[PDB]
Structure 1
Amino acid sequence: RNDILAVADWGQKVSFYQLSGKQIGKDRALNFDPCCISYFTKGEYILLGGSDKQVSLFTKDGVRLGTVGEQNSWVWTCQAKPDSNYVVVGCQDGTISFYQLIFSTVHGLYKDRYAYRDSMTDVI
């Protein structure tokens, strides 16, 4: 079985474990206590919030991609809309924020060749 469990510890790390108990890769050191780990619709990106008063987007491997929102308290939950780029962030202050994530097209073209950005970390 090829299943991945993303784990957000309070030792400030995120791990990825297989169903057999073996780990996938190394840990990803964090400088904040995580309180919410989730996924997008097709499981392509990861949402991470917590002790940092902000929400971050990560690759499915755990490489940080950018900041979704900057909040004023701990983000206790960082879910995402079931079939869209919208994300909703609820924090301890009681604030609920509904962001729409927009991804910029990064590409170049020369005559008969066209390079573009795929999966936010690859060049096709």
Structure 2
Amino acid sequence: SWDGLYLGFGTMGGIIGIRNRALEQLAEIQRSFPIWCMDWTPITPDYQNSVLVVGVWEQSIAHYNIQGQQLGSDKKLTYDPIDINFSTQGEFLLVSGTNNKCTLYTREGGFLIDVATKNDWVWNNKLKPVIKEAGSVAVQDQLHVALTTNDGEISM
């Protein structure tokens, strides 16, 4: 977690475990499908609360609280997700997986664009972090992504 206090792990047996820095069973969730991609929402002055976003292999992305109670979103997907990455300040969400496409979403779940179609599974996609100065003025329209495909291509 971005607060440095919590830790979240997933198992292909369907178990999602949330622990503290002392590695104790703070929360356990049992599913029926393997767990591949997990992330923690970045801290934000507007939100200031951290939730765990996990992409299951039953064509769904789920939001989980600290206590383990689901937020009830359970957004459905056409394709099985593989990787989930959160942009800085928690504004965007880069989702990859089946159909060989790298897509962008809002944190709510609204589709915006797709980035690329690599004709093969994209194992890992990452976003470029940005640093803003004290009172800096800039549109910051530019965005950078790095993709890795299964064939062996590392594209930007």
**Higher relative contact order structure (alpha carbons within 8 Å, sequence separation ≥ 6):** 1
- Pairwise CA RMSD: 1.6
CA contact (8 A) 1:53 1:75 kept: yes
Partner residue in 1 for 2:118: 71
Shift in Å, 1:60? 0.5
TM-score normalized with structure 2 length: 0.58
Give the distance between the partners of 1:25 and 1:81, measured in 2 at CA. Answer: 30
Map residues 20-99 of structure 1 onto 2, 5 A cutoff. 20-83=67-130, 85-98=143-156
Alignment partner for residue 10 of structure 1, among 42, 57, 76? 57
Higher strand share: 1
1:41-79: CA deviations, max 9, x gaps? 111110100112010101111222211111110111111
**Structure 2 counterpart SS, 1:52:** helix
Identity of aligned residues (%): 36
How many residues of Structure 1 are paired with residues of Structure 2 in the alignment? 98
Runs (4 or more) in structure 1 with deviation over 3 Å come to: none
TM-score normalized with structure 1 length: 0.72
Letter in 2 for 1:89: L
Shift in Å, 1:2? 2.1
